[PDB]
């Protein structure tokens, strides 16, 4: 829960999310762009025409919203189990050989 | 008593919560069996 830490009056516009995109995302893919998304038969992504909508939208995190709209801080940890010299482990104490 | 009318009303009010708020449901049921298909997607044909 981070409702009382990531909200601004009148809706918070400091946290944005991409509402429109032309293609599907691959795993662990990061993309930053502002080209106008194309939805109709009129060219977009470089020219502003018909059915060309801005690909970005704002959450508008208000100071008091429902639990489904309050800002929550999310961290995802991805673990790599590939064969390599292990560099991170638990506090499991070592023992004599 | 102990005998009720099987049908009851909803009374959908605009002020009610989203849980009890009306939802318009359409089910598109297809069957994929042996028959000459009459409805197809918008895919252009190609020369034989």
């Amino acid at each position, epitope marked *: 829960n981070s409702n009382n830490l990531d909200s601004k*009056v*009148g809706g918070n516009y400091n946290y944005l999310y991409r509402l429109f995109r032309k293609s599907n995302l691959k795993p662990f893919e990061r993309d930053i762009s502002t080209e106008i998304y194309q939805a109709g038969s009129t060219p977009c992504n470089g020219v502003e025409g018909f059915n060309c909508y801005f690909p970005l939208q704002s959450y508008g995190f*208000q100071p008091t919203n*429902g639990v489904g709209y309050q800002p929550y801080r999310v961290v995802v940890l991805s673990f790599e189990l590939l064969h390599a010299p292990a560099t991170v482990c638990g506090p499991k104490k070592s023992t004599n050989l | 008593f102990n005998c009720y009318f099987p049908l009851q009303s909803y009374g959908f009010q*605009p002020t009610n919560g989203v849980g009890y708020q009306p939802y318009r449901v359409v089910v598109l049921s297809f069957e994929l069996l042996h028959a000459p298909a009459t409805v197809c997607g918008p895919k252009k044909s190609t020369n034989l």
Partner: antibody, heavy 126, light 105 residues
Framework: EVQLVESGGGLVQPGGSLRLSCAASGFTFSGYWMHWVRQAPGKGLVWVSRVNRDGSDADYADSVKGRFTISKDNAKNTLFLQMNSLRTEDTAVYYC???????????????????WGRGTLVTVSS | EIVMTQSPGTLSLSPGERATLSCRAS???????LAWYQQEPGQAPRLLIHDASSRATGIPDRFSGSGSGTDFTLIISRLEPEDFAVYYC?????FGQGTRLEIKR
């Protein structure tokens, strides 16, 4: 331009009947949702009726119910509002007010009004 | 059903000083689907903000406010000689009592 012209109205004795018309020019009248909003002389406003093009629901407020009838003739592009047994307290002006529609895959009206035609006064007295 | 109250009842300020208005629903939450209208005494009302957050096209950038839950507030960035009007707020079924923005002398 897009405008709504109100027709009818005038002095009527108590218990009488009247019909108001709203001709719509400059836009597609049938698709948009339509509404009636009243305005008492020197008072606030209260919405009178909601009509879908089908008009099956939200049409009448209790006090409005039983006395006004709302009709939306799309064929010849106009709106009707007819009353019976009009009472003294309904002396006011009437506005034909539109309801915004997105006109996407689902029309989904938004219950906020876009334009307000010039008012027609109705007065009932002895 | 829903009853809407306006705070304050009257709001008098200088011709340049900005103002804010608070509107309150009687109970429950309506998914923040709220509208604000300003009505000049001689003219018909005019919609200023819809869905309680987004302002309609053609409306000046000055009018900007948002709210959520049972209370929605609308803020006005500056002031010019057009505030001689009564501001009504509209939910699904009812309108608020309104607030007249008076000029101060």
């Amino acid at each position: 331009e897009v405008q709504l012209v109100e027709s009818g109205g005038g002095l009527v004795q108590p218990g009488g009947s009247l019909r108001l018309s709203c001709a719509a020019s400059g836009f597609t009248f049938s698709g948009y949702w339509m509404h009636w909003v009243r305005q008492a002389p020197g008072k606030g406003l209260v919405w009178v009726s909601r009509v879908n093009r089908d008009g099956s629901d939200a049409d009448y407020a209790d006090s409005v119910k039983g006395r006004f009838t709302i009709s939306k003739d799309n064929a010849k592009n106009t709106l009707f509002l007819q009353m019976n047994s009009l009472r003294t307290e309904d002396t006011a002006v009437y506005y034909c007010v539109r309801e915004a529609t997105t006109f996407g895959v689902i029309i989904m009206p938004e219950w906020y009004f876009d334009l307000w035609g010039r008012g027609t006064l109705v007065t009932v007295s002895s | 059903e829903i009853v809407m109250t306006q705070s304050p009842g009257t709001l008098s300020l200088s011709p340049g000083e900005r103002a804010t208005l608070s509107c309150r629903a009687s109970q429950s939450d309506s998914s923040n689907s709220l509208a604000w209208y300003q009505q000049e005494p001689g003219q018909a009302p005019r919609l200023l903000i819809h869905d309680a957050s987004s302002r309609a096209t053609g409306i000046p950038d000055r009018f900007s406010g948002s709210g959520s839950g049972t209370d929605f507030t609308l803020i006005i960035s500056r002031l010019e000689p057009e505030d001689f009007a009564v501001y009504y707020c509209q939910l699904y079924g009812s309108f608020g009592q309104g607030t007249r923005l008076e000029i101060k002398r």
